[PDB]
Ligand binder design. Structure first.
Ligand SMILES: [Ca+2]
Ligand SMILES: [Ca+2]
Ligand SMILES: [Ca+2]
Ligand SMILES: [Ca+2]
Ligand SMILES: [K+]
Ligand SMILES: [K+]
Ligand SMILES: [K+]
Ligand code: NA
Ligand code: NA
Ligand code: NA
Length: 272
DNA sequence: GATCTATATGCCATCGG
DNA sequence: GATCTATATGCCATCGG
DNA sequence: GATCTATATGCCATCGG
């Protein structure tokens, strides 16, 4: 039997329809129930977002500032629609709590809770299914951990990493995100390096820690000059994007007692 | 040329009497 | 009782994939 | 969130005594 971990705020956008004024709490819960059955999940854990990541803010005060800018620019009509949506989503979460173990921890990204759950209890299940449209959750893929995106309708598996992310494995994926940064979170990368040049450098030199150890790289191309100046950026970005390595620290950033209680609660759920 | 940077979509109810 | 005086918090990253 | 629009790189001598 399997474990299913839901990126719950992320999933809620499947219910955002400007031409529907109706509540969706019931359909939200039902969708999760049907996904759990589809994926033979004996355990389902629903995660939700609750404020910006304290762990990441500490390293980067402009973290997700781009998201604030996006919402700031809304028209009066858009704001009204969004407020209705987000109130309906809050109601969907409340209903969810009565049915599934559902976690929100202020100042902790759902990404980090998911990474930690997989590390703590993933071994107790045949397969782990991650319900998220967020490609960064593919930092967690293994032969036993896969992802489903409602947006693309695709299942993401470790063996298809190159098709999906232009890298061959998770370690290269994490390195690539550190070099490239993450536009969605307002984390700048090395200017001039995208997936193609990033993959080439990784293939040649290894992971980001290996690359740092070899700087300066040769070449007078601007993007290499930029890479050569980016040791501190790369170390920082690695902390921000290497979900499996830093998930425990990210949770502990809002209190060690909180981490200890979450650990306890997750272990207990896996026995229920 | 590919590749990268940067922007804007009021996105989104998979799929089966 | 309420009301006022006086003090101490190493406060504080709203909120949305 | 993915996806799309739009921009800027003075790019570029693969690889083997
Ligand atoms: Ca997230
Ligand atoms: Ca189906
Ligand atoms: Ca607001
Ligand atoms: Ca050849
Ligand atoms: K970049
Ligand atoms: K007074
Ligand atoms: K087009
Ligand atoms: Na560009
Ligand atoms: Na006081
Ligand atoms: Na666009």
């Amino acid at each position: 039997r399997n474990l299913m971990i839901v990126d719950g705020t992320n999933l809620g956008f499947r219910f955002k329809h400007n031409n529907s004024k109706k509540p969706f709490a019931s359909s939200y819960v039902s969708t999760i129930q049907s996904l759990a059955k589809s994926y033979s999940a004996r355990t389902t854990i629903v995660l939700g977002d609750k404020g910006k990541s304290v762990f990441r803010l500490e390293h980067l005060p402009e973290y997700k500032g781009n998201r604030d800018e996006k919402y700031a620019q809304r028209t009066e009509e858009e704001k009204a629609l969004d407020e209705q949506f987000f109130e309906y989503l809050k109601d969907a979460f409340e209903l969810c709590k009565t049915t599934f173990p559902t976690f929100t921890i202020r100042g902790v990204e759902a990404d980090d809770m998911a990474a930690y759950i997989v590390k703590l209890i993933g071994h107790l299940y045949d397969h782990v299914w991650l319900i998220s449209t967020d490609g960064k959750w593919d930092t967690l893929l293994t032969d036993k951990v896969s992802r489903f995106s409602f947006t693309t309708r695709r299942e993401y598996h470790l063996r298809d990493m190159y098709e999906h992310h232009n890298v061959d494995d998770v370690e290269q994926f994490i390195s690539l995100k550190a070099i490239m940064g993450d536009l969605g979170d307002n984390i700048r990368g090395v200017e001039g390096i995208g997936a193609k040049r990033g993959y080439n450098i990784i293939r040649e030199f290894g992971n980001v820690l290996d690359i740092i150890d070899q700087l300066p790289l040769p070449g007078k191309q601007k993007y290499i000059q930029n890479l050569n100046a980016s040791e501190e950026l790369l170390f920082r970005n690695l902390i921000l994007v290497d979900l499996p390595t830093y998930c425990v620290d990210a949770i502990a950033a809002v209190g060690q007692d909180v981490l200890d209680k979450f650990t306890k609660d997750i272990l207990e759920i896996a026995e229920q």
